[PDB]
Design a protein around this ligand. Sequence first.
Ligand SMILES: [Ca+2]
Ligand SMILES: [Ca+2]
Ligand SMILES: [Ca+2]
Ligand SMILES: [Ca+2]
Length: 214
Amino acid sequence: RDWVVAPISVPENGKGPFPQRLNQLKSNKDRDTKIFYSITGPGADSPPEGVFAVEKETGWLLLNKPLDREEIAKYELFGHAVSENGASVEDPMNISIIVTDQNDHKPKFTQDTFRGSVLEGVLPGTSVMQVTATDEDDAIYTYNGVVAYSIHSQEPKDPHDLMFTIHRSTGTISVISSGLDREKVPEYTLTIQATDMDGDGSTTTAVAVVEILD
Ligand SMILES: [Ca+2]
Ligand SMILES: [Ca+2]
Ligand SMILES: [Ca+2]
Ligand SMILES: [Ca+2]
């Protein structure tokens, strides 16, 4: 029919070119007279003003610039159709616009520094602590916001290096070697990493400080 518009999905960070046609509004009343189209709503005539617009004569709905999903993920605008003699010829039309995700956010550890402690005599397999990173991108239908964890490096490297691991998805740091000795090394500092696209994407760091208890 005319004067209907299906919900519209727009991936954020479009390259365009801009302005960009999305949909065309039309009233059947335009055989019988000249019609002027307009658009109102948050994103059109109210903040953020002028992201969307509509061509007066043609009814083309237009996007004027790239969208950001994490700023605004959905718009509801309203289309109007007014004849040349000034009478509206349609009831204002609901235009729904959905902003879909691209992976444009690095993960963030919730703290710059995490602390955990174990007794000197714990067995290999012992959970020390659980660190967490978040990611603002979609983690439901994509891996854009799915974080894989890894250990970047360990200091010091006595009695040897790679004495801990991290659970790839939970962030649980565990001890995988024997040989802890508070007297020799009372404390380890682990730089830890969080990578989105489940390990294929971009990566941030944090520190996890492990104390060997007395
Ligand atoms: Ca964004
Ligand atoms: Ca991400
Ligand atoms: Ca995103
Ligand atoms: Ca990568």
